[PDB]
Enzyme design. Structure first.
Site, PDB file in Angstrom:
ATOM      1  N   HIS C 135       0.856  -1.200   0.000  1.00  0.00           N
ATOM      2  CA  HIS C 135       0.000   0.000   0.000  1.00  0.00           C
ATOM      3  C   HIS C 135       0.890   1.247   0.000  1.00  0.00           C
ATOM      4  O   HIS C 135       1.048   1.924   1.020  1.00  0.00           O
ATOM      5  CB  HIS C 135      -0.983  -0.008   1.195  1.00  0.00           C
ATOM      6  CG  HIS C 135      -2.063   1.036   1.180  1.00  0.00           C
ATOM      7  ND1 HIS C 135      -3.269   0.821   1.825  1.00  0.00           N
ATOM      8  CD2 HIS C 135      -2.080   2.278   0.632  1.00  0.00           C
ATOM      9  CE1 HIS C 135      -3.983   1.919   1.621  1.00  0.00           C
ATOM     10  NE2 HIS C 135      -3.309   2.823   0.905  1.00  0.00           N
ATOM     11  N   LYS C 218      -6.627  -0.316  -8.485  1.00  0.00           N
ATOM     12  CA  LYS C 218      -7.069   0.124  -7.174  1.00  0.00           C
ATOM     13  C   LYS C 218      -8.451   0.763  -7.343  1.00  0.00           C
ATOM     14  O   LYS C 218      -8.611   1.628  -8.208  1.00  0.00           O
ATOM     15  CB  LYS C 218      -6.084   1.111  -6.566  1.00  0.00           C
ATOM     16  CG  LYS C 218      -6.685   1.904  -5.427  1.00  0.00           C
ATOM     17  CD  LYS C 218      -6.901   1.059  -4.200  1.00  0.00           C
ATOM     18  CE  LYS C 218      -7.346   1.900  -3.036  1.00  0.00           C
ATOM     19  NZ  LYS C 218      -6.320   2.845  -2.622  1.00  0.00           N
ATOM     20  N   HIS C 220     -10.845   3.074  -5.523  1.00  0.00           N
ATOM     21  CA  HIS C 220     -10.896   4.039  -4.423  1.00  0.00           C
ATOM     22  C   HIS C 220     -12.172   4.862  -4.537  1.00  0.00           C
ATOM     23  O   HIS C 220     -12.583   5.190  -5.644  1.00  0.00           O
ATOM     24  CB  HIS C 220      -9.658   4.938  -4.415  1.00  0.00           C
ATOM     25  CG  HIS C 220      -9.505   5.743  -3.155  1.00  0.00           C
ATOM     26  ND1 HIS C 220     -10.333   6.827  -2.876  1.00  0.00           N
ATOM     27  CD2 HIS C 220      -8.592   5.625  -2.160  1.00  0.00           C
ATOM     28  CE1 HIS C 220      -9.915   7.305  -1.715  1.00  0.00           C
ATOM     29  NE2 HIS C 220      -8.871   6.616  -1.241  1.00  0.00           N
ATOM     30  N   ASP C 222     -12.925   8.004  -3.887  1.00  0.00           N
ATOM     31  CA  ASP C 222     -12.776   9.358  -4.434  1.00  0.00           C
ATOM     32  C   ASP C 222     -13.012   9.390  -5.936  1.00  0.00           C
ATOM     33  O   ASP C 222     -13.401  10.437  -6.463  1.00  0.00           O
ATOM     34  CB  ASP C 222     -11.448   9.998  -4.010  1.00  0.00           C
ATOM     35  CG  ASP C 222     -11.353  10.281  -2.508  1.00  0.00           C
ATOM     36  OD1 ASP C 222     -12.067   9.601  -1.719  1.00  0.00           O
ATOM     37  OD2 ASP C 222     -10.564  11.178  -2.116  1.00  0.00           O
ATOM     38  N   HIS C 247     -10.733   0.436  -1.495  1.00  0.00           N
ATOM     39  CA  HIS C 247     -11.099   1.456  -0.507  1.00  0.00           C
ATOM     40  C   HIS C 247     -12.618   1.667  -0.774  1.00  0.00           C
ATOM     41  O   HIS C 247     -13.007   2.340  -1.750  1.00  0.00           O
ATOM     42  CB  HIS C 247     -10.303   2.746  -0.732  1.00  0.00           C
ATOM     43  CG  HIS C 247     -10.656   3.883   0.184  1.00  0.00           C
ATOM     44  ND1 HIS C 247      -9.681   4.540   0.923  1.00  0.00           N
ATOM     45  CD2 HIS C 247     -11.848   4.494   0.392  1.00  0.00           C
ATOM     46  CE1 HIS C 247     -10.317   5.495   1.576  1.00  0.00           C
ATOM     47  NE2 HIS C 247     -11.623   5.499   1.294  1.00  0.00           N
ATOM     48  N   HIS C 273      -6.845  -1.177   4.420  1.00  0.00           N
ATOM     49  CA  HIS C 273      -7.264  -0.618   5.718  1.00  0.00           C
ATOM     50  C   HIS C 273      -8.583  -1.192   6.215  1.00  0.00           C
ATOM     51  O   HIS C 273      -9.597  -0.498   6.302  1.00  0.00           O
ATOM     52  CB  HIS C 273      -7.230   0.929   5.721  1.00  0.00           C
ATOM     53  CG  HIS C 273      -7.755   1.593   4.484  1.00  0.00           C
ATOM     54  ND1 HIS C 273      -9.095   1.544   4.143  1.00  0.00           N
ATOM     55  CD2 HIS C 273      -7.100   2.343   3.568  1.00  0.00           C
ATOM     56  CE1 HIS C 273      -9.203   2.240   3.016  1.00  0.00           C
ATOM     57  NE2 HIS C 273      -8.031   2.745   2.635  1.00  0.00           N
ATOM     58  N   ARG C 333     -17.086   7.729  18.416  1.00  0.00           N
ATOM     59  CA  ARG C 333     -17.886   6.580  18.877  1.00  0.00           C
ATOM     60  C   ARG C 333     -17.590   5.308  18.035  1.00  0.00           C
ATOM     61  O   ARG C 333     -17.406   4.221  18.602  1.00  0.00           O
ATOM     62  CB  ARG C 333     -19.390   6.920  18.868  1.00  0.00           C
TER      63      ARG C 333
HETATM   64 FE    FE Z   1      -7.572   4.519   1.244  1.00  0.00          FE
HETATM   65 FE    FE Z   2      -4.285   4.745   0.616  1.00  0.00          FE
END
Ligand code: FE
Ligand code: FE
Ligand code: FE
Ligand code: FE
Lengths: 225, 564, 564, 113
Positions: C135, C218, C220, C222, C247, C273, C333
């Site tokens: 990563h 990848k 992602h 965004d 992601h 992640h 939380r």
């Molecule tokens: Fe990410």
């Molecule tokens: Fe990243």
């Protein structure tokens, strides 16, 4: 010593902080890099002492330097500061919002043509629609997402959202919390309305001809109950 | 939907009619036009515009951009406007409104944001062309990072390194030295062009140099700038379409300024340090700036005129030229008159370019700051230009930006490739934060790739943590530097396969259209006048009216930004 | 003859049954076996073993090693044992007992120490495979020395440099950018592999990228991680044997976690992640880790869970994603529940890999320290694993080392070349002094050559005088870097001569066997469970039991070793 | 901070000046590089205070270090010194002729035939 390239960087930052401290003691108003290094060295010192938390430091460093302790415009030039330091629990990022108190001077100042609001998506026909997030988790929907294809957790008259998007600023999202009900404002999608992707309910032009097929796919996939 | 003006500006940057303060100067750039459709602006991020089948197209297109600079405020001789900039194949593919015609209104046809598009947020940033420093002494390779860190992407001049000839003159003399330097150039991210020794009264020796790859010639008094040399050099330059740069006969040994002008014979020539502190016929070299054929530039140490300019020079001249301590003054009476006039002449558009004179009576990373310091100084002394239309300094800004971008490009015959933010040109651009405009750039793009930028801690969880300093990026490395950097040569050298013959891996391009560039060809600095110098008072006159300026006690883009 | 145990250990390092403390942690590595013959151990020096006709052979052999690492303590998923390591042709030629069969007993046949053999004393040192950071955001070329200085030799990811798209996503998008970056890669010592933009609902744009050299894609948010883009991306990866990294849709715009899992359709995917702070479906992304097809990894900022983890994040998210200061909390939380669980899940073998997320919500030179800090934290909390056989932490050690060595290699289809200390593999190894294990390496070997190491004063009479800091070695320079470094590409690109076509001088190797890697394929981290998240309390559950850990007040391999 | 490569150089020069100051305070006779850094740091300090002109500093720094404050031959070895510093009016070059007072010892002396 086995000095890593990141440790070599920190020495320069720390020395710059020490020079800035000396100049402040001389009674000089600190400039942009001096102010940043002065606050950075303080953060690096407190982290080594390992008695303060990241939370404590982030709070402590707001207006660490006062407007009269720095040159004019310095505070506005540095709206936020970030410094990674080793704490007893490891390297942590210390983020300070407004580390230097601002003044009336602003370098790179923007003076508006008028205070009048900007009419976004001018002339597009607004469609009011009641939406309910019947799901257990909150969700957001972006300005250019084909509203018709939104999470099946959202309950609304999908037929009325066909070929439309949210009348909100470009790049913004609308939040609909778990169980929350909202009135959304929808406008027809720009350009050719060639909707390709998302949930694949349409994958073509959002015309009347494609509508029945799209409504059937939406029902079949569980978007329309 | 109605968006609060402050909220719009925070999200997308300024729009039509908004005024931006350039750094900490008193110069205000007004957005002349905005190429967007309100509500269709591109924003990159989670839940934002540039996403699959939304702002980013799912429909393949021949014009799918390699990079999109969203909501940029362009500051260029072409205009001060708001637009999206589209890069493709390391060139400015389009300027206008980028996005997806499938889902958006008013998208510029050749500005498709697609699967292969990278995003760079220009919202609230100033985008300008990369600066061209046409007075480089290739003394030290350490000048290059300093130059890039100050928004300079192209460097013309000469040298071999830390030797007396280079220390003095911008000259890479003869075939062997030119070949060696062109091969040394491979290392760098900077675009280069080398000048040979123009100080010759023999054709053969001049021709050899153009054929060896020189982009022109430098006539410098250290090798004797006699009328014979001036004529022979220009004759060869005219034959080979290359530029001539000149440091005139300071001691008027072979003749006075008029004798030099006569030798030139209305031929195109680039007059370095036109003011004369950097060198040239004492005390009337500045008188050349009025002439149509003379393409004049200034060196950084005299611009802007400050309370320490004269004092610094009456010793800086002694370290550079290596003069006896027995020599005290003449420069104390001659210099104030010409240094003061120089600033006003810049404001009047009489002096067309600003250059460095790097480590040879001038600073490498000072071209850009010093140009804006002078612009600011004049505005503060003489007020807003009469030429201005509206509550803005747009005309003055365009006049000053042209000095280090377009006008050097026109002079050196590279205006077709670089020099301005225009469709079809190579993507050599600089991204600036308005609070740091003209003093500290954010990102340096060369050939469509980021080559140099301000970068924080290498270990850090984000790119913002301290210490933030200038570092080389991917475009400056490996074989990607050969893709992003240009070594300019003469047409003769180019056409005779200099690239292959010297095994240069860099982009090799010829300089063209040097000989027919006059003052009329420049952008916003086409002013011609009858410039005279009183030989007793040393005062400078423009068409009989005293041309002067007061020395600055403090300058903008300085004290607030630098540690030392 | 009988040698005192202390004297043996001082001379040759630990033997069978001895326990080594890893750094300042509470983890103990026990020597499982010793491949030597007591009395025949190789020692280099004056009057020592490795000498002409003695320990060094005078008999020519086809297996004469290029380098011998004498008396190494190997720590690998394959075992924790004592052996001599033999390098030949930049590969691990043999592991066992090296020397001269003419004068010594029990020499491994293909481990000949001869005239052409170089000696490296590994007695008392720990030898591990070079780490793989799957990563990497290619944001700054300055990440590379930081990474090497922390035992990382291979980096997979994407980027163009410090542009918004890269600051957020591990993507080098489109043909042109992929070509540019693969050429930029030539500069470095680090092994690289690039990911293209997976966020497409169109085949053509994805295919172009694999053919341009991408090792995978990848997806992602965004760029829009919708179910349509998930399906289209995986379909192309399946066709071209490349890996996909994800992601997820944090905001649950197009669906919930189960809708994303359904889109994947049991296909191999590297879920970045997995905890969720770095991004992904709020608050249930972690629930994916239980699934067999999901190859999960953790990023550095959340591991280990400390008393400052949550505070640091509730602001680090605002600098990376560029969020309004009006936004205060939800993360206050949601976050404690998943960050705490993450540590436990690592100890249970549920999360198989550790990664960095370099300068995009994560630290470049922290993968290795943070993995061992977590191992130590868990050992201190939960105790010695019940899986252990003896007074040692071998099983736990093997579980943790696999997270940054073998498991990333399996995921990315490079397990045949790198990832572990095994015969036939490329010699990408790290030498560690036990007191500095996991925090500060001694020597970095890549392709059988030393590329980076801790080095003292350049003038100094020996290599030990201060200041001792990390420096690039011969293997990292000239044309030797082309011999020691690999640029990984897709099979399609490899087979179509990408190396020649892009003029890459580096070793070009294809990624293979990405599509049929499940959780079962990993080493020591094959655990599948029913992971759930309470949508009200945000507490994570493994098979109905709460999955949690206590935050650390202090961590190992930190305060004792670093200045700042 | 946005530190330029030239600002990174000046930190080293300034730190060298600070080390030289410490050694002078210890009563040690400064050598060639120590003497240059000691004078350079003074110039850099006065420029930041922005109360002195370049003309003032050029005059002030002649024999800034005395023959007994430095090792023998040091003054002769450094006949002139140049240091660029940022003043309120911008970066200016401070040129000092005879910054260190010479003594009758001369390293590299030419003795005529
Ligand atoms: Fe990410
Ligand atoms: Fe990243
Ligand atoms: Fe000159
Ligand atoms: Fe010059």
């Amino acid at each position: 010593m086995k000095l890593t390239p990141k440790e070599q960087e920190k020495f320069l930052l720390y020395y710059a902080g020490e020079v800035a401290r000396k100049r402040k003691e001389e009674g000089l108003k600190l400039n942009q890099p001096e102010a940043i290094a002065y606050i950075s060295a303080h953060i690096m010192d407190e982290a080594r002492r390992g008695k303060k938390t990241v939370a404590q430091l982030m709070e402590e460093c707001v207006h660490f330097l006062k407007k009269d302790e720095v040159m004019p415009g310095v505070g506005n030039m540095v709206p936020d500061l970030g410094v990674e330091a080793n704490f007893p629990d490891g390297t942590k990022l210390v983020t300070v919002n407004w580390p230097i108190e601002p003044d009336d001077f602003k370098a790179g100042e923007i003076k508006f043509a008028s205070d009048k609001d900007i009419e976004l998506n001018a002339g597009k026909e607004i469609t009011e629609l009641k939406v309910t997030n019947k799901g257990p988790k909150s969700l957001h929907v972006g300005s250019h997402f084909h509203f018709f294809e939104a999470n099946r957790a959202l309950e609304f008259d999908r037929e009325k959202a066909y070929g439309k998007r949210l009348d909100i600023p470009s790049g913004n999202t609308l939040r609909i919390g778990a169980g929350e009900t909202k009135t959304v404002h929808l406008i027809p999608i720009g350009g050719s309305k060639k909707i390709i992707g998302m949930n694949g309910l349409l994958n073509g032009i959002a015309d009347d001809l494609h509508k029945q097929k799209a409504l059937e796919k939406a029902k079949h996939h569980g978007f329309i109950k | 939907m109605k968006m609060k003006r402050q909220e719009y500006v925070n999200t997308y940057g300024p729009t039509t009619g908004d005024k931006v303060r350039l750094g900490d100067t008193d110069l205000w750039a007004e957005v002349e036009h905005d190429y967007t459709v309100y509500g269709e602006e591109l924003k990159f991020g989670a839940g934002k515009t540039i996403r699959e089948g939304m702002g980013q197209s799912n429909s393949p297109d021949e014009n799918t951009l390699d990079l999109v600079i969203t909501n940029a405020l362009i500051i260029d001789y072409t205009g001060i406007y708001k637009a999206d900039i589209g890069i493709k194949n390391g060139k400015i593919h389009g300027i206008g409104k980028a996005g997806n015609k499938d889902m958006q209104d008013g998208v510029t046809p050749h500005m498709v944001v697609g699967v292969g598009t990278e995003a760079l947020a220009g919202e609230g940033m100033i985008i300008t062309a990369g600066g061209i420093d046409s007075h480089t002494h290739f003394l030290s390779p350490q000048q290059f990072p300093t130059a890039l860190a100050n928004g300079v992407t192209t460097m013309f001049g000469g040298g071999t390194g830390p030797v007396d000839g280079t220390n003095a003159t911008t000259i890479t003399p003869g075939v062997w030295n030119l070949h060696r330097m062109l091969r040394a150039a491979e290392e760098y991210g900077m675009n280069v062009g080398l000048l040979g020794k123009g100080n010759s009264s023999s054709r053969a020796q001049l021709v050899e140099q153009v054929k060896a790859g020189a982009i022109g010639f430098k006539l410098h008094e250290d090798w004797g700038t006699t009328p014979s040399a001036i004529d022979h050099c220009l004759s060869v330059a005219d034959e080979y379409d290359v530029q001539v740069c000149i440091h005139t006969d300071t001691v008027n040994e072979a003749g006075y300024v008029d004798d030099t002008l006569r030798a030139m014979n209305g031929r195109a020539i680039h007059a370095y340090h036109i003011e004369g502190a950097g060198g040239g016929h004492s005390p009337d070299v500045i008188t050349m700036a009025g002439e149509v054929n003379i393409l004049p530039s200034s060196t950084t140490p005299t611009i802007p005129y400050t309370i320490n300019t004269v004092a610094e020079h009456l010793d800086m001249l002694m370290t550079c030229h290596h003069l006896d301590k027995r020599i005290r003054f003449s420069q104390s009476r001659i210099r104030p008159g010409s240094i003061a006039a120089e600033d006003t002449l810049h404001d009047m558009g009489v002096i067309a370019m600003t250059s460095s004179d790097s480590q040879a009576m001038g600073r490498a990373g000072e071209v850009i700051p010093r140009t804006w310091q002078t612009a600011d100084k004049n505005k503060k002394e003489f007020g807003r230009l009469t030429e201005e239309k509206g509550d803005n300094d747009n005309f003055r800004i365009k006049r000053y930006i042209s000095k280090y971008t377009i006008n050097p490009a026109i002079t050196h015959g590279v205006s077709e490739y670089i020099g301005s933010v225009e469709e079809g040109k190579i993507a050599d651009l600089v991204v600036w934060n308005p609070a740091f405009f003209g003093v500290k750039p954010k990102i340096i793009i060369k050939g469509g790739m980021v080559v140099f930028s301000e970068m924080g801690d290498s270990n850090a969880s984000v790119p913002t943590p301290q210490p933030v300093y200038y570092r080389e990026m991917f475009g400056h490395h490996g074989k990607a530097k050969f893709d992003t950097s240009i070594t300019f040569v003469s047409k003769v050298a180019y056409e005779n396969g200099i690239k292959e013959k010297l095994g240069l891996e860099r982009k090799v391009l010829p300089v063209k259209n040097c000989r027919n560039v006059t003052k009329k060809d420049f952008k916003f600095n086409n002013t011609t006048a009858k410039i005279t110098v009183n030989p007793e008072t040393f005062e400078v006159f423009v068409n009989g009216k005293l041309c002067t300026s007061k020395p600055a006690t403090e300058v903008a883009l300085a004290s607030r930004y630098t540690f030392f």
